[PDB]
Amino acid sequence: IQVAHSSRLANLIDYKLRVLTQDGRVYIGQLMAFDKHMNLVLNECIEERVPKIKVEKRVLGLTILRGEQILSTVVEDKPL
Amino acid sequence: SQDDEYVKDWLYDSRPLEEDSKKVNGTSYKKWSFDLPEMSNLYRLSTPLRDEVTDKNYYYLFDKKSFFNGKALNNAIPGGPKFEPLYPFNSIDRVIFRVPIRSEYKVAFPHLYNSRPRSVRIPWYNNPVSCIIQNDEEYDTPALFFDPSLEDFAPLLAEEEELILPNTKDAMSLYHSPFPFNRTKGKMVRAQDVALAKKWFLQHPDEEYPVKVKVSYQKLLKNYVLNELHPT
Amino acid sequence: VSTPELKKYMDKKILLNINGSRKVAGILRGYDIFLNVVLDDAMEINNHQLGLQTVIRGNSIISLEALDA
Amino acid sequence: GWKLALVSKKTHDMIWEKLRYILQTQELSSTLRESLETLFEIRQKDYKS
Amino acid sequence: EHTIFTQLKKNIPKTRYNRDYMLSMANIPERIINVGVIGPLHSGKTSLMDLLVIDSHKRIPDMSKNVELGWKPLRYLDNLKQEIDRGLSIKLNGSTLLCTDLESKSRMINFLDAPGHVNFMDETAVALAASDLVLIVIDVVEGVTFVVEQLIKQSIKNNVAMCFVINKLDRLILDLKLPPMDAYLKLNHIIANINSFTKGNVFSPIDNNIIFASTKLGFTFTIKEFVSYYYAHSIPSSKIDDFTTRLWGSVYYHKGNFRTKPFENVEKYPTFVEFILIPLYKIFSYALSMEKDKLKNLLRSNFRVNLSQEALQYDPQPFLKHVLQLIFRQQTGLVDAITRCYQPFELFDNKTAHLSIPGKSTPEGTLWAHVLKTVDYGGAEWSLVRIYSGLLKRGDTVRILDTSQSESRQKRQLDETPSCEVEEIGLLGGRYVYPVHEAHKGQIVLIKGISSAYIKSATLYSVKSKEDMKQLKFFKPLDYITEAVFKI
Amino acid sequence: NGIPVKLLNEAQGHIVSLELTTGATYRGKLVESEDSMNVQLRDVIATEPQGAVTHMDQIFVRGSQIKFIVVPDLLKNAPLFK
Amino acid sequence: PVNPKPFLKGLVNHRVGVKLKFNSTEYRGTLVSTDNYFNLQLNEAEEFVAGVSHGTLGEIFIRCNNVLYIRE
Amino acid sequence: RAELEELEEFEFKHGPMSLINDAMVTRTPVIISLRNNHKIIARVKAFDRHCNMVLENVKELWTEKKGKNVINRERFISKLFLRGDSVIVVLKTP
Amino acid sequence: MVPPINCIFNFLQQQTPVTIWLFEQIGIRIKGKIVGFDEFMNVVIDEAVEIPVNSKGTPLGKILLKGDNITLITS
Amino acid sequence: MKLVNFLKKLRNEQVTIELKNGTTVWGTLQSVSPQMNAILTDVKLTLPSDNIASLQYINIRGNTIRQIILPDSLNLDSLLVD
Ligand SMILES: Nc1nc2c(ncn2[C@@H]2O[C@H](COP(=O)(O)OP(=O)(O)OP(=O)(O)O)[C@@H](O)[C@H]2O)c(=O)[nH]1
Structure with a gap:
């Protein structure tokens, strides 16, 4: 995996981002919009839960992720 | 060198501005772009020849369209031109001559009051103009009319105490002016191409000139309409 | 400041989902900006009523469902 | 009023200003209001008679 | 080909938003407002419509140079040969515009620039019958004449939402050259008249019913819009509502950081005057008279506005128009006013009943x-x-x-x-x-x-x-x- | 103002899905949204965390409980972003 | 008239018993002072683990968010 | 902003926020119970409104308990930042 | 219409049989009568009683309970 | 009075971190937000008896951050004063 040594989150917007969630799932997709409260809008969001064995996988598309239920953000891949 | 403080130096030149590289295009002398106050000066100077009629309504049943209509029906508006005719039920028993149906109407609503119209244009129709002009030595005042019955921050454009600048009294006037002075930039035209005289006879004849002068006016309008009418 | 528009649901019975899979039936009496539901108490989840007039706190609300249309 | 305009114009203007200020921003009597209105109408011509 | 004209082509002028999106939006009700803009003869309603359309679309063919500049009004909604040559809106030439509100939301509107002349009121009647909200439009100068009153009565009798546009401020600032307090007074008188006519709901700049427009210069605003634009930096998030409520309705800022309702010792003017009207005056006065560099600086500072280097060399009217556009970003405040006004959709029943049974x-x-x-x-x-x-x-x-x-x-x-x-x-x-x-x-x-x-x-x-x-x-x-x- | 909350309110009317902290998904026409995501729906299917589907006419939700909201592919187009 | 905050101001310099939510325990010590946040401080606070004093903690400062209820 | 910090330090000295402020002034080791069960013996350096507190001389005490094997575990850290919400009860050891 | 502030002002003056449920808590309830009210939802309760849930009358007195962990009230 | 001042003044330091669940995080302090959001480049994670999961870049939510183990060469009193 490769990414630029970025200063802040908004500078790397529209990047394929692995986004953890407090309930155990991880949402992977290119981020369109962020917030002061860390609400995120993934362009091609993909629902990936970790069941109690192997990864659960599901496609969502354009979705809002609420900020409170986020654990953290990670860059998965580049734009385009 | 006080009222006419800017133009005075150059108003009488062969080419008004040979250099003045900011104010004109250059020495080719193709385009120009004056600042405000000099434009104001020009306007003031032009008081004798300037169009001097802001109320666009004024040319009512006196536009080129109106003239054309008059032509097309032989319903000459008496202040204006009268042409060679364009061409070579309804009984007294029937109709009721309550309104004596005038020629002025026959061009106003040409398709309605004038039956059997041919080659007839449609004129304008308009809103009432209340451009109140100021006389002198003041600004922003109701004069000609009556009045109605009844966390540490300042508002916008703060530290701009004077509402009106010394030029805005004149700028407003300029803004209301017609096409010559209206604007603060233009392309040149040939002295030839400027019509200092058209604006007098296109607008209405002032007051009680001798018949001959009235005739002259009419003649001029007849020419003008013809020129307008056969686009070359 | 944004007032949750419960005037569509005012004076109607509502199935309020609240903390720990608990339910509350009851006709609505009023509310505030925090979503604290002032409601006429009804049977709580077979089924049994606690209280006559109730005020549920907003933080404890999971949801509130339209029982009456 | 016209005479006032003629010579002591600043005061006349001032008078107008005060009048208007009174006219619209006041719990003013109705007859008085009508008189004022009349005044302004005449002002529009500035005493023809 | 033909004289009495429209577009008649594949290449319709492209929109800023995409028409696919607009049509998608139009799938559901509660997201299609039928405006049917109304008013007297030469209200400016057609010009307002034109402004909206231009705001919406990228480049129109008919938007010639002069109209773009703002000498002539791009009367985009008088398509008929006659309606041009005659100078009157005559038939319903509305538009479907995916309009953004002040708050972030995208609603496709069906405007209808109806005629104003009172012989054509027949045509106008259709708009009332059609439209669920009505943008009544009024000239400040003429004020509310009888025609406007009649229109209002019709709308109330026809059971339709109302959201007024006090139009052509340019006239009272430049034609009449009214002082700002005088202007305010005039406005009050007008709105008073409106209130008198409309026995039911009371209209005002507060609640975003009234819209302050000048379609020749090409700008409309609700106070909410303007406030949002230029009184969000200064005052905090929560107290903005209060400020909005204050601005209009005789409250004087008093040279101090929390106004009094009655008279104030130091300054003279109201908040609406001091905090809106006065700014407009400053703009107009300066967008004519002020040495352009100074104006540019002020715009840069207070409004956060960058003048195009072309705009510096515009003529004084079109320059002014451009500046105004730069200031009041879109016809967005207007849309907010509409949406907020027509947040009742229980009136739909009333309307339908009125029309049929x-x-x-x-x-x-x-x-x-x-x-x-x-x-x-x-x-x-x-x-x-x-x-x-x-x-x-x-x-x-x-x-x-x-x-x-x-x-x-x-x-x-x-x-x-x-x-x-x-x-x-x-x-x-x-x-x-x-x-x-x-x-x-x-x-x-x-x-x-x-x-x-x-x-x-x-x-x-x-x-x-x-x-x-x-x-x-x-x-x-x-x-x-x-x-x-x-x-x- | 919150640009994701901007999107939510712009998404009103479409058939949107919604899972909470509880893990119980929903799906139906949205009706109302605010700064705090005080969501309302119509024609909403209400699948419990186990998978027990219960169709119902309406629902109201509090924003604190919301986890994520499935928006359609139309809001990808216009007009909130640019 | 007997509100919480004035009774709490009367409860200053008096013995109090603190109960909490998760991984929690009753207490018993003389309240020292309070604020609008309801941050507590006790002297001779005994760690009553479900009403069983596990240890005399003494001079302590309890956080506001984990507070459930406070009694005599 | 300055008047709020003045009443902050004023309300600390009089209120119960004075305790661990005085513990920082005396600079002693203090035990702190935690949300995920960690009795933190450490020297308090920093102190704010929210009870976030940088800790010198750190010594966390806990029990990683799994497999019927009580393994009371503990570690020393040079310096560590504490978040407020984790704290349950701070106490100054005599 | 009755906001929660006004309904609790009825509970303040009345002091009628209140039953309280608790936040993040199903195992225990309370039974008393409302005596206080804060600008927050903090309320002091006299004659309060700890009442474990019907899956008895256990001892409890007068309590200032931190009101940010409330669920039910009903006087 | 704000430790946010100090945490803002902590820049380009390689630090360990704990979370609400208790996950370790070894990475350079790229920046820290006014609400504790630890922006970190060149990061390495290890869960709470579990094996390594190293990564390129992680900005973690402020509330999820439990306890940041600071580096060795660190004068606390130098940054605390203005
Ligand atoms: N001074 C000034 N004039 C305006 C303004 N807006 C419009 N006008 C003028 O008045 C006319 C009114 O606008 P139009 O759109 O042409 O008229 P309309 O609204 O179509 O009137 P109807 O045909 O009755 O609908 C324009 O032709 C302009 O000349 C303004 O803001 N200021």
């Missing part, structure tokens, strides 16, 4: 629509139809009833004999019929096949059951407010 079992899924008026919008016969329930698809058969046969039909009910196809559908957009297959509920579209099925102002329907048909109702003939008594 008080009834129910209408949302069974039976498509039915008020055929408003036959128009000649692309030259050809079109029928402007407002759909209420269901959705109409292209190449569908439909029952149609001329509202001559409306009362009679009603009487007879207490055998769908007339019928016709729908050859094509499209959307009015000032100068083009933009073709669309869908024609969803709660909106206005143009259809080919209806026209010849009726004379004026028909109803349509397409029941899937006789029982359903029994449940139906039929619109009354549109009582065109003016009676025609000019016999030729």
Whole structure:
């Protein structure tokens, strides 16, 4: 995996981002919009839960992720 | 060198501005772009020849369209031109001559009051103009009319105490002016191409000139309409 | 400041989902900006009523469902 | 009023200003209001008679 | 080719947003406002419409150089040869515009720039019948004359939401050259008049009912809009509402950081004057008179506005217009005013009842629509139809009833004999019929096949059951407010 | 103002899905939204965390409980972003 | 008239018993002072683990968010 | 902003926020119970409104308990930042 | 219409039989009568009683309970 | 009075972190937000008896951050004063 040594989150917007969630799932997709409260809008969001064995996988598309239920953000891949 | 403080130096030149590289295009002398106050000066100077009629309504049943209509029906508006005719039920028993149906109407609503119209244009129709002009030595005042019955921050454009600048009294006037002075930039035209005289006879004849002068006016309008009418 | 528009649901019975899979039936009496539901108490989840007039706190609300249309 | 305009114009203007200020921003009597209105109408011509 | 003109082409001027999105939005009601802008003769309503359209679209062909500059008004919604040459809006040449509100939301509006001249009020009546909100528009100068009052009465009697536009401020600032307090007073008088006429709801800049426009210079604002733009930096998030409420309605800032309701010792003017009107005055005064560099600096500082280097060399009117555009970013505040005003959709019932009859079992899924008026919008016969329930698809058969046969039909009910196809559908957009297959509920579209099925102002329907048909109702003939008594 | 909350309110009317902290998904027409995501729906299917589906006419939700909201592909187009 | 905050101001310099939510325990010590946040401080606070004093903690400062209820 | 910090330090000295402020002034080792069960013996360096507190001389005490094998575990850290919400009861050891 | 502030002002003056449920808590309830009210939802309750849930009358007195962990009230 | 001042003044330091669940995080302090959001480049994670999961870049939510183990060469009193 490769990414630029970025200063802040908004500078790397529209990047394929692995986004953890407090309930155990991880949402992977290119981020369109962020917030002061860390609400995120993934362009091609993909629902990936970790069941109690192997990864659960599901496609969502354009979705809002609420900020409170986020654990953290990670860059998965580049734009385009 | 006080009222006419800017133009005075150059108003009488062969080419008004040979250099003045900011104010004109250059020495080719193709385009120009004056600042405000000099434009104001020009306007003031032009008081004798300037169009001097802001109320666009004024040319009512006196536009080129109106003239054309008059032509097309032989319903000459008496202040204006009268042409060679364009061409070579309804009984007294029937109709009721309550309104004596005038020629002025026959061009106003040409398709309605004038039956059997041919080659007839449609004129304008308009809103009432209340451009109140100021006389002198003041600004922003109701004069000609009556009045109605009844966390540490300042508002916008703060530290701009004077509402009106010394030029805005004149700028407003300029803004209301017609096409010559209206604007603060233009392309040149040939002295030839400027019509200092058209604006007098296109607008209405002032007051009680001798018949001959009235005739002259009419003649001029007849020419003008013809020129307008056969686009070359 | 944004007032949750419960005037569509005012004076109607509502199935309020609240903390720990608990339910509350009851006709609505009023509310505030925090979503604290002032409601006429009804049977709580077979089924049994606690209280006559109730005020549920907003933080404890999971949801509130339209029982009456 | 016209005479006032003629010579002591600043005061006349001032008078107008005060009048208007009174006219619209006041719990003013109705007859008085009508008189004022009349005044302004005449002002529009500035005493023809 | 033809003289009495429209677009008649594949390449309709491209929009900033995409029309696919607009049509998608138009799938659901509660997101299609039918505005039907109204007012006296030369209110500026058509000019307002033009402003909106221009704001919406990228580059129009008809938007020539001069109109762009702002010498001539781009009267985009007087498509008829006559309506140009005559200088009057004459028929309904509305547009479908995906309009952004001040708060972030995207609603497709069906505007209708109706005529103002009082002989044409017939045409206007249709707009009232059509539209669920009405942007009444008023000239400041003429104020509310009788015509405006009449319009208001009609709207209230026709059960339609109202959201006023006090238009042509440029006149009172430049033509009349009123002082700012005087201007404020005038405004108050106007709004007072409005309130007097409208016995029910009370209109004001607060609550975002009134809109302060100048379509020649090309700017509208609600106070909410303006405040949002230029009094969000200064004052905090929560106290903004209070500020908004204050601005208008005789409260004086008092040189101090929390105003008094009554008179103040130091300054003279109200908050509305000090905090809006005075700024406008400053703009106008400076956008003519002020040395351009200084103006540029001020714009940079206070408004956060960068003048184009071309705009520096504009003429004083068009320059001013450009500046105004830069200041009041869009016709967004106006849209906010509309949406906020027409947040009641319980009025829909009232409207429908008023038009046809008080009834129910209408949302069974039976498509039915008020055929408003036959128009000649692309030259050809079109029928402007407002759909209420269901959705109409292209190449569908439909029952149609001329509202001559409306009362009679009603009487007879207490055998769908007339019928016709729908050859094509499209959307009015000032100068083009933009073709669309869908024609969803709660909106206005143009259809080919209806026209010849009726004379004026028909109803349509397409029941899937006789029982359903029994449940139906039929619109009354549109009582065109003016009676025609000019016999030729 | 919150540009994701901007999107939510712009998404009103479409068939949107919604899972909470509880893990119980929903799906139906949205009706109302605010700064705090005080969501309302119509025609909403209400699948419990186990998978027990219960169709119902309406629902109202509090924003604190919301986890994520499935928006359609239409809001990808316009007009909130640019 | 007997509100919480004035009774809490009367409860200053008096013995109090603190109960909490998760991984929690009753207490018993003389309240020292309070604020609008309801941050507590006790002297001779005994760690009553479900009403069983596990240890005399003494001079302590309890956080506001984990407070459930406070009694005599 | 300055008046709020003045009443902050004023309300600390009089209120119960004075305790662990005085513990920082005296600079002693203090035990702190935690949300995920960690008795933190450390020297308090920093102190704010929210009870976030940088800790010198750190010594966390806990029990990683799994497999019927009580393994009371503990570690030393040079310096560590504490978040407020984790704290349950701070106490100054005599 | 009755906001929670006004309904609790009825509970303040009345002092009628209140039953309280608790936040993040199903195992225990309370039974008393409302005596206080804060600008927050903090309320002091006299004659309060700890009442474990019907899956007895256990001892409890007068309590200032931190009101940010409330669920039910009903006087 | 704000430790946010100090945490803002902590820049380009390689630090360990704990979370609400208790996950370790070894990475350079790229920046820290006014609400504790630890922006970190060149990061390495290890869960709470579990094996390594190293990564390129992680900005973690402020509230999820439990306890940041600071580096060795660190004068606390130098940054605390203005
Ligand atoms: N001074 C000034 N004049 C304006 C303004 N807006 C419009 N006008 C003028 O008045 C007319 C009113 O606008 P139009 O759109 O042309 O008229 P309209 O609204 O179509 O009137 P109807 O045909 O009755 O609908 C324009 O032709 C302009 O000349 C303004 O803001 N200031």
